[PDB]
């Protein structure tokens, strides 16, 4: 009951599993969305470009 | 374009329609006298003197 943080190695594994699912979702979709390249609008010539 | 009759109009990496009507952060232009007889030298692919 007293220590549920650094003392519990198993707790760190649960934190890692939560971190992995969130990190994979954000890196695979959110980071790729918007600037996929160095500069991207998600598609070519969205409005101003012709 | 109206001020000077154009012998040739060529745009590379951009549409001619786009160059007339697009939003660009900055415009840089160079004006110089270039002979009609020598137009081949001023080509990016070619390496004329």
Locus of tokens 């160079």: B30
Give residues after which chain B gaps, C-N over 2.5 angstroms. none
Interface test with A, best of B11, B18, B20 (most A CBs within 10 A): B18
**Nearest by Cα to B14 from B27, B1, B4, B5:** B27
Distance CA A50, CA B16 (A): 10
Residue A50 tokens, joined: 């012709």
What is the DSSP secondary structure assignment for residue A44, as one 8-state letter?
T
Torsion of CA A33, A37, A43, A48, to 10 degrees: 120
Distance from CA of A47 to the nearest CA of B (A): 10
What is the DSSP secondary structure assignment for residue A26, as one 8-state letter?
I
Which residue of chain B has the CA closest to A49? B22
Distance CA A32, CA A22 (A): 15
Residues of B in contact with A48 (CB under 8 A): 22-23
**What resolution (Å)?**
2.8
């Amino acid at each position: 009951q007293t220590g549920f943080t650094t003392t519990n190695e198993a707790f760190q594994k649960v934190q890692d599993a939560v971190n992995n699912n969130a990190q994979a979702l954000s890196k695979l979709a959110s980071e790729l969305s918007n600037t996929f390249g160095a500069i991207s609008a998600s598609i070519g010539d969205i409005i101003q470009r012709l | 374009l109206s001020l000077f009759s154009v012998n040739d109009f060529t745009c590379s990496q951009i549409s001619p329609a786009a160059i007339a009507s697009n939003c660009y952060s900055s415009l840089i232009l160079d004006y110089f006298s270039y002979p009609l007889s020598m137009k081949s030298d001023l080509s990016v692919s070619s390496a004329g003197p």
